[PDB]
Write a protein that binds this ligand. Structure first.
Ligand code: MG
Ligand code: MG
Lengths: 285, 285
């Protein structure tokens, strides 16, 4: 019945477990954590400096512990279960990996999620997971990731997994075509999130990039399911993001979007996504 | 005769060759470049987002081309020669290396510098180089680095090389003692720079840490030769940094320090370092 676009309110840079309920309390239905690697081994949730103004940059957790904690918050029946916490983005810091490390990294992240988040399929967390890779050329990470899940007999868990290949930002930003191709190379034919944020390096081209992405998402044979925009932290920019048609707002202050979604106008066009909003489904209305 | 503290005016985040002369023109006598790695292979000069307000974050160059350009700007007689450009800091982004990739990374950077910067001692660039590593545990990088120079018969080029081991930030920042020990582990017994101010995740302990570092540098048994404070971009903070006793200012706007150094009550205490100021020599008060 509801014709409003479901919005993911993604708490930005939530790398310490103590912060999780705090961001969820502010109204986030999703969070983003930065997954650091030591070689192919996903090691910490940790962003580091520099980071957004008004944020401490160095909060962290062991990756395993972070995932186990996400599981608690997203397992129905758990004492800590938050039914409003529906998705998390793993901002996978694979940018320094050698080529030989990319597939094993994907395998290692799969193993981590399987063991720690999905608990080997034994009543795991129900939240959707977006694997956000910073290089379209890292699609072997996804191939390895998928291969682990399939080999361990949990291919069904890929229902819960989405992908966002962005970058690299040098020597140039990938075009949408290139991105789409990267997905095909990864064997990804759905569950695709596109983010737009980090680079405000070519303002008029970035305005164009966002609109191009939105148009692509909303196009006949589009491949992008959701678009999220990051560090939207003010009412004005939150409204702008919603009004341009994004599905996801990544923000340091999830309460902002909550307030905006209450507002006249906004409240008849956009709504906070719930678990029953398939994050892999392109919004049409 | 001149008893003023020589100051390194380090242009922050200069990752594109086109930026080099612009920063030097603003008055920097030094610059800092972020050296990215793909496994153990130094690949780009490139910082990436997020970065300082007022800065584009994604300027870049291939590492060798960057080094070649630095060589040009610092080889007497070269068309591009800048006699006032006396040091650069390689902010080596080894944070994601596996333990096994650390030494080879050091070896690789040594080879790059040897071939492309120093040209094997055949009238290469004259600037001093600070190898800035983000983990005191990465001392093998320096061991590998020194090994290469020594093996290739260019141990003398270590006269031009200094070291700044800091971090990592997790679980805590290392003590000065731990940092000193890391130098010992690298076989580094001089040419030590310490940088402060990347984070202010504990303002009180941050203040104390700088004062401790300064005290340590200025102690008879000290190991720190120079202290640089990073992102100091305003006159007020510039003056504050000089007044607290740092030897170096890392800044997005080298012109600020240039103006400060002209001011009364600064111009009699501090001066812009020149090539004849040994950056490995602790300033004696
Ligand atoms: Mg992130
Ligand atoms: Mg840097």
């Amino acid at each position: 019945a509801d014709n409003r676009r479901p919005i993911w309110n993604l708490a930005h840079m939530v790398n310490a477990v103590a912060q999780i309920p705090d961001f969820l309390d502010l109204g986030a239905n999703a969070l983003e954590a930065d997954v650091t690697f030591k070689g192919s081994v996903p090691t910490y949730t940790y962003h580091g400096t520099p980071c957004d103004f008004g944020r401490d940059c160095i909060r962290w957790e062991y990756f395993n512990v972070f995932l186990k904690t996400l599981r608690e918050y997203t397992t129905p029946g758990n004492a800590k279960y938050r039914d409003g916490f529906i998705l998390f983005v793993l901002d996978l810091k694979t940018g320094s990996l050698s080529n030989d490390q990319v597939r094993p990294a994907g395998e290692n992240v799969a193993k981590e999620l399987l063991q720690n988040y999905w608990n080997n399929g034994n009543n795991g967390g129900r939240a959707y997971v977006v694997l956000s890779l910073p290089d379209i050329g890292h699609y072997e990470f996804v191939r390895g990731f998928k291969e682990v899940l399939k080999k361990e007999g949990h291919e069904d868990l890929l229902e819960k997994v989405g992908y966002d290949f962005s970058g690299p930002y040098l020597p140039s930003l990938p075009t949408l075509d290139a991105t789409h191709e990267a997905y095909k190379k990864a064997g990804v034919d759905g569950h695709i999130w596109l983010s737009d944020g980090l680079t405000n390096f070519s303002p008029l081209g970035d305005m164009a990039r966002l609109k191009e992405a939105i148009k692509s998402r909303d196009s006949a044979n589009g491949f992008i399911n959701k678009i999220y925009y990051w560090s939207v932290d003010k009412v004005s920019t939150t409204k702008a993001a919603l009004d341009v048609g994004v599905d996801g707002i990544m923000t340091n202050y999830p309460n902002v979007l909550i307030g905006v979604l209450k507002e006249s106008g906004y409240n008849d066009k956009y709504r906070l996504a719930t678990y029953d909003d398939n994050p892999w489904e392109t919004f049409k209305n």
